[PDB]
Amino acid sequence: IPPTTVKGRDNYDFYGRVDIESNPTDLNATNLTRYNYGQPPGTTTAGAVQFKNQVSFDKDFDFNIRVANNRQSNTTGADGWGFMFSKKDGDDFLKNGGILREKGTPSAAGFRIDTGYYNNDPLDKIQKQAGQGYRGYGTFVKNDSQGNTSKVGSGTPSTDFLNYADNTTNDLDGKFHGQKLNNVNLKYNASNQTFTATYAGKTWTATLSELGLSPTDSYNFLVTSSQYGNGNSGTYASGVMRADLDGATLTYTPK
Ligand SMILES: [Ca+2]
Ligand SMILES: [Cl-]
């Protein structure tokens, strides 16, 4: 079987607090997939789109999607993005969590673009997330067989750091602006058993061993976001996170 590349909304199931924003006012785009709209932070403020067919790590995988982060502080906005492999589905993600906190569904792994501070997350402490502006980070993570999340693969706090938004409105400066649509590339090279993620001009690397995933078992792939809340002060904003799912590309090899 040769690889195929698919594109289109119809290739994904929608779970939880995810919808389509037909006509964004602030982005050059239509029909964006939108997370965390119309609901305050809490246990159920989470969403996933799940590719309808399974992948396995005997074969290459390549996924590209443009994402646009909320232009909201890390104490008011969303938790981030989790590009997650799981043997279970989007309902299991809604029940048990993902890869954006300290614990989620067991034996999942993937790439985390972290945009939200949580007072009980030890990785947010390591990564120096607390503070002003739009402080976040990228990294691979895995959930162990209990669900506990840990950083895996390349990076240090200094190199993982990224400003996930800014206050500018210019399209001429040659700079990254995380509130605009910017591609995320997540790929897996079966020949060297290595996952690569790129975003914001930065790269991260992790082996299959480091992610803890099976070399042969079938996995689902989910694009997740959430806004679970950081305490109960009532200080929050919309947490709206958007992705061009209709324009995304996913390359895999069907059985
Ligand atoms: Ca965080
Ligand atoms: Cl449509």
Side-chain angles (χ1 to χ4, degrees), residues 2-255:
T4 196
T5 301
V6 297
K7 172 177 294 183
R9 201 191 306 147
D10 295 338
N11 298 297
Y12 297 85
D13 287 317
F14 284 52
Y15 297 87
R17 205 73 196 178
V18 57
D19 74 341
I20 293 287
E21 183 184 20
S22 63
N23 293 281
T25 55
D26 61 329
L27 294 169
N28 171 33
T30 62
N31 294 332
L32 295 178
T33 296
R34 176 170 61 185
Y35 296 74
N36 313 131
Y37 176 78
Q39 186 161 296
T43 56
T44 74
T45 308
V49 300
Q50 180 174 330
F51 183 56
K52 285 177 184 185
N53 297 143
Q54 302 194 303
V55 304
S56 60
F57 298 123
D58 58 297
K59 300 295 181 182
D60 290 345
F61 171 90
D62 197 357
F63 182 66
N64 285 273
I65 191 165
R66 297 186 300 150
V67 304
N69 303 321
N70 55 205
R71 195 209 310 255
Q72 294 169 9
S73 78
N74 71 16
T75 53
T76 60
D79 300 329
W81 297 104
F83 303 90
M84 184 176 77
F85 298 106
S86 178
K87 294 179 181 179
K88 296 186 163 182
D89 72 10
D91 291 317
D92 169 80
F93 163 71
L94 297 177
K95 178 176 173 185
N96 295 129
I99 58 165
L100 279 163
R101 285 290 184 92
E102 82 293 359
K103 181 176 155 63
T105 193
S107 302
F111 187 61
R112 180 190 183 133
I113 303 174
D114 192 317
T115 65
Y117 176 79
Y118 181 49
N119 212 43
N120 287 15
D121 189 333
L123 188 54
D124 287 4
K125 278 186 194 49
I126 287 163
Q127 302 291 60
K128 308 287 194 189
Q129 182 165 41
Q132 307 168 304
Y134 305 101
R135 298 181 66 83
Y137 57 92
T139 181
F140 285 101
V141 297
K142 76 178 178 173
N143 293 351
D144 68 17
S145 65
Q146 278 299 303
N148 303 304
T149 311
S150 62
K151 171 175 178 78
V152 302
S154 68
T156 66
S158 174
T159 70
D160 288 344
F161 182 83
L162 59 86
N163 298 114
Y164 61 80
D166 67 43
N167 291 324
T168 72
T169 59
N170 103 79
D171 297 295
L172 306 178
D173 59 4
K175 298 178 180 180
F176 172 80
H177 306 290
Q179 69 278 6
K180 298 181 202 285
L181 285 160
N182 291 283
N183 194 59
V184 180
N185 184 14
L186 176 59
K187 59 184 200 190
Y188 176 71
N189 180 323
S191 74
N192 75 358
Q193 295 163 25
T194 295
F195 295 86
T196 305
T198 66
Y199 182 61
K202 305 172 66 65
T203 305
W204 294 260
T205 309
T207 67
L208 179 68
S209 182
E210 284 167 349
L211 288 201
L213 299 173
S214 171
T216 58
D217 296 339
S218 295
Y219 284 91
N220 304 311
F221 180 65
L222 297 88
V223 180
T224 71
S225 187
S226 55
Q227 188 186 212
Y228 297 126
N230 179 53
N232 207 48
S233 66
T235 303
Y236 61 80
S238 72
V240 164
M241 298 287 274
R242 293 173 292 173
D244 184 8
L245 186 65
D246 288 20
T249 58
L250 193 162
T251 306
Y252 80 119
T253 299
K255 295 256 211 290

